Point group: D2
Chain length 288, copies 4
């Protein structure tokens, strides 16, 4: 009897969605954590069947969405959330959306979960290059994109079965330089990729939980479109031109590998950056 | 209905067998390629029921062994087999056992296959360390345990459908040094992990076929015992003491990962070393 | 005519000192940036000849200390420094010790410098393990240990000659897990190691400056003693027991490599993590 | 007063020569080991002044060539040289040219040496890609360009002082794929980079000798021209266009790094691949 929390959703054009579709294939209950600023739009959009098409699985199954909670990766507990976001139009008429508040809500309603997905990123200044990034700007990126992963584990470790599994999405910009991947994201993902290891050790030895990370090719998600003729269009162009696998990478191409990593079928794998990127990661020089 | 060729089983105590079992679970049909030295024993042993306990699958399955063929990875085509090997006690009574000849035999009997497993390694002077390995010994190591992959691939690709997948097995002693892993075994493993990428580019672009490699943790196999209470018993103790996951590492743990990679679930992963080893590889210092 | 700024000093038992001794060997003017809280103790200690012994270079040379400035890697400009540290006993009777204020002071007095050393770390919670680290705690570590490097480059790029060179000290805890290396340091060093690359590209293409990083073995510095029978005593124990180079790693063992990296003799090397650690980094399993 | 043996010079257009020059600058004495095919030409050419322009060092130095010996890296001892090679036009008139024989010759003439350079690579089927490389071709690649290092080391160690150092040259196509780098050259390079560690452990612990390897950028050498406006001209264009450092890569750039590693300045570095390549290796995506 299986439950998965997915932290990081605001639409259906991302990897979290990809991941939720493939998990559904093996009958796993999905709990979405939506960033509060878009929680209400996402919810109204759901009710109104915008995703009814996107919720279909090959074999005549609905995606089994157990619940849909506001979730904000920038605050660990209730006592971390500041006054300005306390007023905030959007945040104001929701509650219990810190990391710890949602680890509780979920636990409260459905018991122990046993799969966890970190699928979120923010870098206020992704626009700028690493050199022109401000401290405040850089640290937000690390807080929201890297630390949040640790913070999830701490709070969710307590509501997880043993032999549970955690994942997290990463990008190659942390190993090799991609110009334009600014704001400290590259920085942020390096730490993620390393924290993944150290967590794998603490989580592995103490609770017998596994944690891994998926290094993803480029997908024209709502968030990648925000980066920028958008660098995501160029990343996909190059990738489909040059990657050893000449096909088009789909969000479920990631979903399947994730479903695998969240399953027992992978009990011997932990602390791994796993590359799901049509093989681009292995190339040095272009063919032309 | 998929068919897979596993190159290099001698007994039910290896990773090959582990991979055989887990594939069977997913209902894929098994062609075993066996080293002539041990062909007749394996065959005799199999007939006498000795493997019957070992062919038990959890959900009351047997094992779909489609065939058991003599096979030797040193010989590419028939004009390679030297007059001595040709005439040897073991080799004289057997036929069609070069890489090309079994690629043909299998094709005639069962048509194009879609999965290919490389689970053999060999090295004359394995007991001698790198410095004291002869040229003859080292090139032999590489020939048997590295090149056989490139050759398996040259010949087998033409009897494989597109979207098919190929995996091999490696050891972490290619990346960081474990002394006692001699005779150029480290060298061959490092070659095989590089070969794995170059081939992922050629096979990827030209056949839309994927190739990957599992860097496995330590197992008490027949051939791991051969290294000179032995180095493998020490390895298994270290792993079970110092690895993030303190569970005993089972060949079916590798088995199920190999299964995953050979399936369509892994359609966007290629050219990668995947570690299946309880996460030992992430450790720098023993905590104790 | 050569000048080097070294950001991160409070005594003579660290790597910055090691680095300053070896640079002196090739007649490079040294400018120390001391953390304000210990600036005055360090200065009084200097005047009183505590370091007169440590200032000797093999070949009858004094270390040429051009100047000694208070320097605080946690504030980028004057407008970043808060009220509490504005009162602060220690900080209060010093001025111009932000990153930008010192890039100016130096420039003002001696012109363009042409070698830059980042040799500093802070992680408030190094005591704890990654899991038990707080957000505030983690982000301090990244701010002080990782971001500061970027911040140096931005401000110092402007007072550097072209063909200048920058370095930074790192630790293997970012690639492989060392238990006990907590507080987000591991995290911090990963980002450093990656920022080093991305900076190498921006700095390389724009100003023709090189930037590299030195991955150091363990040294019983004043700061390592603070970590903890102190994990630094254990790190050295293991290292001297097991590293391929059986000798004792000295702070100048690092100093020489740094002097090399800061010289023109290395004009083709950039964005590199360079391991100066008696070779420990390359080992998997112990000998026993 | 140090002596170094450079294995593999054919002309003044390679990295060997570059390494020869930079060493000379540091006043170390040069023993050249030359491949018999080109021995007589090199020698004749040298006598006729043709290299005199090329032997200019900046600070009005010449070059301290202590000796120029015939040398062939395929033959370990004299009982290896087959009757055919023994009798060949080029090989018949020359003597003491196996790895052991020159290790002896040099010892008799000049006593124990302290520096050792490995700047040779060779591969029969370099023009064919990995998939289409024969077993014969590949093992030949490995024999010549990989094993010769392990053998140079077995024999030369006993005519080397402790604290001595050994370097070899590699290409980045061992890590990420550059197609056109065939015949198993990628494979040999990957072996050599693994060999480099295993040997750093054996030589480190048993002789207190260091071994490292320079992964060089592209140079218009004689042997780089041989690969089939050629692949190397494309390589040089890519490097000079897309690398962080847009300066033209010169063999003396490698030269001076090799010098550094062979000196005591690098006493704490061993088993490493050091990249000397204008930082190209850090790039994932071309910015343009
Ligand atoms: N698509 C790609 O090109 C690509 C490639 C490689 C890796 N990735 C990674 O995959 C992951 C998913 O990104 P995506 O591409 O699916 O785009 P996306 O827009 O679906 O993902 C970003 C999501 O995170 C949310 N978010 C931001 N801050 C948050 C916070 N504090 N709390 C809760 N939610 C928050 C956003 O609202 C959004 O829903 C990211 O970590 C990204 O770094 C993406
Ligand atoms: N066992 C371990 O502890 C371990 C750990 C990590 C990696 N690996 C790797 O996994 C793979 C399989 O390991 P294993 O322990 O299961 O080995 P194993 O005990 O199954 O023996 C390998 C098999 O290959 C066969 N073989 C040898 N030479 C051959 C040739 N020329 N042609 C055809 N067949 C040949 C042998 O008869 C043997 O049955 C190897 O590549 C090994 O490097 C093993
Ligand atoms: N010795 C080792 O065991 C070892 C090993 C590998 C790497 N390193 C790295 O080497 C570098 C130097 O450390 P060390 O071992 O020489 O110890 P150290 O005590 O000399 O270095 C820390 C110095 O940084 C200073 N500092 C802290 N925060 C600062 C700030 N905001 N502004 C200015 N200065 C500040 C401290 O006062 C201290 O002088 C560090 O980056 C460390 O991570 C050390
Ligand atoms: N040139 C480049 O663009 C480049 C780039 C990266 C790495 N490298 C590496 O640097 C090293 C030297 O490269 P290079 O371009 O200077 O080569 P090169 O043009 O100097 O040729 C190598 C030399 O080795 C000699 N040689 C070949 N086989 C031999 C044998 N069996 N015994 C003794 N000598 C032998 C050849 O005569 C030749 O002079 C090689 O290992 C190469 O892989 C070269
Ligand atoms: O954080 C932002 N950007 C952003 C950028 C990259 C991201 O992810 C990736 C996208 C593509 C690749 Cl190829 C890799 C990625 O990791 C994500 Cl998920 C978000 N914002 C919010 C505030 O400012 C506007 C944009
Ligand atoms: O090649 C041989 N030995 C050998 C050594 C390692 C091997 O594989 C591994 C086993 C354990 C680990 Cl931990 C890693 C491995 O790679 C294999 Cl399959 C075989 N021979 C020939 C000489 O004696 C008989 C066995
Ligand atoms: O930042 C702190 N600790 C600290 C820890 C490790 C450090 O460096 C290293 C030391 C050893 C190795 Cl082996 C590696 C290192 O990177 C440094 Cl320079 C500082 N503090 C200040 C506040 O709390 C008390 C201790
Ligand atoms: O082995 C041969 N070719 C060859 C190829 C690459 C080599 O080295 C490299 C050159 C450029 C880069 Cl960019 C990388 C290299 O490693 C070397 Cl020294 C030699 N032969 C034999 C057949 O024809 C004559 C030359």
């Amino acid at each position: 009897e299986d439950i998965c929390f997915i932290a990081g959703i605001g639409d259906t054009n991302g990897y979290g969605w990809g991941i939720a579709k493939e998990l559904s294939k093996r009958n796993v209950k999905i709990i979405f954590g939506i960033w509060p600023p878009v929680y209400n739009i996402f919810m109204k959009n759901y009710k109104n069947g915008k995703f009814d098409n996107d919720m279909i699985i090959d074999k005549d199954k609905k995606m089994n969405i157990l619940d849909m909670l506001p979730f904000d990766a920038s605050f660990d507990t209730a006592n971390d959330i500041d006054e300005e976001t306390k007023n905030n139009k959007r945040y104001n008429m929701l509650q219990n959306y810190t990391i710890e508040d949602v680890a509780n809500l979920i636990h409260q309603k459905y018991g122990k979960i046993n799969m966890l997905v970190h699928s979120l990123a923010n870098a206020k200044e992704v626009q700028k290059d690493l050199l022109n990034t401000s401290r405040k700007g850089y640290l937000d990126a690390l807080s929201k994109s890297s630390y949040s992963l640790i913070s999830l584990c701490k709070y969710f470790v307590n509501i997880m079965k043993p032999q549970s599994s955690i994942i997290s999405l990463t990008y190659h910009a942390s190993q090799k330089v991609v110009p334009g991947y600014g704001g400290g994201m590259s920085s942020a993902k390096a730490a993620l990729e390393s924290d993944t290891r150290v967590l794998a050790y603490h989580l592995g030895r103490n609770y017998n939980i596994r944690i891994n990370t998926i290094s993803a090719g480029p997908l024209k998600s709502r968030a990648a479109t925000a980066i920028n003729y958008t660098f995501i269009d160029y990343a996909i162009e190059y990738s489909e031109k040059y990657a050893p696998l000449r096909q088009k990478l789909l969000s479920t191409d990631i979903g399947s590998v994730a479903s695998f990593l969240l399953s027992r079928e992978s009990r011997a794998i932990t602390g791994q950056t796993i590359y799901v990127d049509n093989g681009l990661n292995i190339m040095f020089l272009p063919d032309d």
